Design a binder for this molecule. Sequence first.
Ligand SMILES: [Mg+2]
Lengths: 63, 63, 249, 63, 63, 165, 87, 264
Amino acid sequence: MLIEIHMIQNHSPANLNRDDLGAPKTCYFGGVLRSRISSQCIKRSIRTSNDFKALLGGVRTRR
Amino acid sequence: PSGKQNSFAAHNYPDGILVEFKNSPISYANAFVRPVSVVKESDLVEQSIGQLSNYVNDIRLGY
Amino acid sequence: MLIEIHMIQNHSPANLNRDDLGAPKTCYFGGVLRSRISSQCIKRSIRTSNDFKADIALCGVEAALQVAHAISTHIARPEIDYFVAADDVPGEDAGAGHIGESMFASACFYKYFSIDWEQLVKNLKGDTNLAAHTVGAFLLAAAKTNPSGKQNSFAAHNYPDGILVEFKNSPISYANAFVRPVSVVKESDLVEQSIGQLSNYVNDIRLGVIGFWFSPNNRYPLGYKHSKLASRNIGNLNELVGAVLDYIG
Amino acid sequence: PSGKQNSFAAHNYPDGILVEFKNSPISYANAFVRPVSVVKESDLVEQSIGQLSNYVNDIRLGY
Amino acid sequence: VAADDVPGEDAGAGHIGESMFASACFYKYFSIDWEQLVKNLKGDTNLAAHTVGAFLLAAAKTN
Amino acid sequence: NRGTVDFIASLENLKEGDLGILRKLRGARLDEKLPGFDLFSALWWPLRQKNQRAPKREVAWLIAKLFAEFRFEQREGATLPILMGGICRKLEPKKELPRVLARFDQLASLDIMQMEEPLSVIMGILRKHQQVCLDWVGLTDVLSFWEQEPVKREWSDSFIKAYKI
Amino acid sequence: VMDHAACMVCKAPATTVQHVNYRRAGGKEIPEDLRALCRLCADACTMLEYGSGMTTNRIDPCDPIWRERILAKRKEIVEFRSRGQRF
Amino acid sequence: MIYLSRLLIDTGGNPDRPRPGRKWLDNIYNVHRRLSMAFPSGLRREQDPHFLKPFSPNDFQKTPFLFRVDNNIDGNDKRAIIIVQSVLEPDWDYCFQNALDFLAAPPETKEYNPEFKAGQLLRFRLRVNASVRRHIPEMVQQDGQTIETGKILHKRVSLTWDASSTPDQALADWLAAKSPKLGFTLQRCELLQLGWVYGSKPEPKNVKVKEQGQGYWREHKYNPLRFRAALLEGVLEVDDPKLFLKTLSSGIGKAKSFGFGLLS
RNA sequence: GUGAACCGGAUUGCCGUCAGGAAAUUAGGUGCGCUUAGCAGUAUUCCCCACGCUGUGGG
Ligand SMILES: [Mg+2]
């Protein structure tokens, strides 16, 4: 059994994600330019969120 | 996301949650294949929710 | 008698078919480069999962399917990505990961299916009404589960919008509708423009059967005239399944 | 002004005149920022001259 | 309009056009820094007083 | 075309008050002020009954607003990607050329209604470089068909051709 | 004269006819889609249509959601119309 | 049951802006129409409060009633007065609910009941038509050579009075002789206004036919109507307070719909 | 049905982390809308029932 969670978020002028050159991420959805936020950034911010601290129990280290 | 929030403190909150329980997930990306162009009445959030609810209608009756 | 499931399928931005170097696969048609998923990929995606299994005479007498390469209705648009895997343990410097590059494409596809008379009757399995039951499963099982791919990082399972099913017996793909890749004009959708191109091709070729048309809550009509180019502008889940069931027998 | 005076004949001569000589220009139009309302006892020329005298005394004393 | 007086032709006028104007009640704000001014003039107190007083007079009496 | 030329010529006939009220309507649709709609109707109605081809209504309204704001003169051969590009050669390629160049490329991915402000900044730097002539008929009939990509690519290649020369 | 030579929203002697449901702009028009309607409020209909989107959906001054805007536009029509400057 | 009231309309002051009330007063058919869709019904009152519906006069209550358009000065302002009264209660919140430009000040409802007994000096004006059926409708004088062709037509032509007098002692004689029928009298009468009043009424017809039903396809037609006016006053002495109330409920003359009504 | 069948390129990823576009500005001077006017008038008032044929019910 699987759960879907959908959001529609309007944001203030911001740069939450950038590529190597520093531009906000863009995708060509439906033939037009759509602003994109990377999935990994959302996953990381939810990982480091202030309520996951009782459950934050994974480390990704080379040291 | 902890991007340039020190320079753009955009901590706005999700103006929509859609949780639906099923064994075949769906993104409402096709709710906005038509780009949302705002009108003089309402706002971008309401027009986006309106197109999303139109899509929810014909995927809750047509699909 | 032959079943042609001409199907449109838009896709939210995600890579589905990957070559050696990881790009979305591409085809050449109409003097332009268009995005492509391989017919083997979508055909295996029709197998290998139990939701469709609710079929071994159809993808094995060999097998009974003609699945075409997903020709995009427009030009290919491959994009690129840039990921950084964090260190999460404080070292003398920051950043640790592979710092690689991924790549993706959003496209609206088309395909064509073929199930003949004896190619479904001699399929048989064990019944003679199975030659209608399996097809009835297929006409919406082909639009049931988008393949697979990098879904854990690029979540895309956009259901299709406009579905054709024809009972014309002469096997012709309508890919010549997309000889000119679909451009975008502001008053219509990309899927709506593609469906208008398909409709414009439909009004041709008949000059030199029926049109069983699927539009969920008929948001997409096959022609903006009372002289409808399909004359069956309806469709709701298994209503079309049962209508093909008693069209065949 | 001799506009449409063949049909109306409004040759109405003057009620009061304020001719001054000073070193900086002023306009008492701001006296009639309050419109002149007719009282049952006096005519509007006398009333307007009273309002003008009020504001003239204002500017003469307060500047 | 601009009307002609010599009757060299039929009863024409000359140049016609338009003018645009308005009338309003205005709000004006000024701010004179003191120690910044006395640093800019380098210790001339009486000329700074001349500046502030003449500014207070010239903002009011001049249009 | 023999229909847009009359529209541009009638726009050049407009006197100071009419284009003043057109100037005051920047970024505003032709509904919230009655005199603006009246002026647009007077400019836009009588050219459909004399010639069979007319521009789009939104293009006409936007072009009238921009014409009132900037007040150029009509001259053949002075389209946007020639004068643009000609001014790009008068630039330092290190820093300012990408700035002005991105300001120009912003136009190529926008719909007709939202281009009022990017066209405003493009014509503002045109006014800063003292440009008097602009082909309003040429701009209008490349803008009324702005949704087909061949004319956009032709406009861009005109910018390329004017830049390499 | 189906509506007795009268307006419909702001009832008064009628002059012209407006068009609703632009499925077809009309070479052949069925008589259950038009709207015989007076000069000032048809001018307000053209107010609302010419501003914002042009599209194919129309005004239909029957369901009372497009009412306040029509009356306000008619008010500024009454206040600001220059008949000597045409229209 | 007198329901005397007033409807002070907004005459303009700029014949460059559109003037709705001034144009509305020029056609008495539409004046009657405007005054008659007031107090509409309670049949569909609970459905909509916004006056946005396809018009049909059948839903409106068909009670005959009266009005009169006049002009007066209150103390300092000219404003044309409309005086109405009817047997049904006033509900002008729907007739002008989207045509507020027709009005100048919100209308006021009064209550009044008459008592005159006999022979007082406290009466008021009157409006009537000068309409008589013709003694000699002479044989339809046609045109082409200024000739006469037709037979007869009983028409309500205007009153052809004498040629050696003026109508302030001719029409005065007329209603002075008419008064003992209706239960009053005239000791003095001087006319104030006289002339013609015009209008236009549309006629639905049917010529064309429809191929799948009856003849819905059909055309338009207009027709004019004219009346002769008389607005006048008098100091009158009612004969009896038992039959003059019927005259105060019907009016001297019965134009009713077209302006000329009862004594006010 | 065929140098063709039947057939995944799969899973792991924050680009992050520092940034006043600031210093200076009279929107300038020229101009008549204007020549002409009774809101009056009996001798058919468009009608429909309807009178000894001009009173009587209204569109
Ligand atoms: Mg109206």
